[PDB]
Write an enzyme that holds these catalytic residues in place. Structure first.
Site, short mmCIF file in Angstrom:
data_model
loop_
_atom_site.label_atom_id
_atom_site.label_comp_id
_atom_site.label_asym_id
_atom_site.label_seq_id
_atom_site.Cartn_x
_atom_site.Cartn_y
_atom_site.Cartn_z
CD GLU A 164 -2.71 1.07 2.62
OE1 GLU A 164 -2.14 0.68 3.66
OE2 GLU A 164 -3.91 1.40 2.58
CD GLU B 244 -6.93 7.55 3.19
OE1 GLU B 244 -7.10 6.98 4.28
OE2 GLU B 244 -6.25 7.04 2.27
#
Length: 216
Positions: free
Chosen positions: A98, A200
């Site tokens: 990631e 986010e």
């Protein structure tokens, strides 16, 4: 030329642009049109959101351009994506990676990471960090994987055209021996190895907005 995403989870394309969109509750929505203009508005009251526009796949030579017109304080704004090599052992934390290139943040999510190096890209100074996630969610289900971070030495301002030169971050990570597995496949169980400009928002205390446009 647009979708308004209000469901708890959705991925797909709007014109040439890919998106991912994830919510564990609340009314947070993502609007995206075929020209890469996007709008995230979030509830304020403690659910979590991760989502934004991008390409299903990571291109090592992509030059990402974006501008934010509004950003009221999302936990962070970051280029966000995955690499995955189905032929590697799943007990090797590099089999799946990631990665984040942070643009703005309320708190620094890279703080658990070990420092790699400092470099310059598009005249912006970045530092890199690598952390590990142990048995955590991923595009291939629960697994243990590395996270690669690039963090700029200052927050990237609103109202300006910015550039993220992905090749520079790939190179900086590789310079410290942090290799990205394949970024052009669907081999994983849950998602392709996408690359998006992620908004986010974790446990937001106030209502919020992030809007702008992305392209390459």
């Amino acid at each position: 030329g647009a979708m308004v995403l209000t469901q708890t989870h959705a991925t797909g394309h709007v014109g040439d642009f890919f998106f991912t969109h994830w919510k564990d509750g609340g009314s947070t929505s993502l609007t995206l049109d075929a020209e890469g203009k996007f709008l995230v508005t979030w509830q304020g009251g403690g659910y979590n959101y991760v989502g934004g526009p991008g390409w299903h796949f990571g291109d090592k030579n992509r030059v990402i351009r974006y501008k934010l017109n509004e950003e009221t304080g999302a936990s962070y704004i970051a280029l966000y994506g995955w690499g995955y090599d189905k032929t590697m052992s799943e007990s090797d934390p590099s089999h799946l990676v990631e990665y984040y290139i942070l643009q703005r943040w309320t708190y620094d999510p890279s703080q658990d990471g070990i420092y790699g190096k400092t470099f310059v890209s598009n005249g912006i100074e970045y530092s890199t960090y690598r952390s590990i996630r142990k048995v955590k969610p991923s595009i291939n289900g629960p697994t243990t994987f590395y996270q690669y971070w690039s963090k700029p030495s200052a927050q990237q301002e609103l109202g300006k055209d910015h550039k993220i030169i992905f090749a520079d971050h790939v190179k900086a990570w590789a310079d410290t021996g942090w290799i990205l597995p394949d970024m052009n496949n669907f081999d994983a169980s849950d998602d392709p190895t996408y690359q998006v400009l992620a908004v986010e928002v974790f446990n937001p205390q106030k209502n919020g907005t992030a809007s702008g446009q992305v392209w390459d």
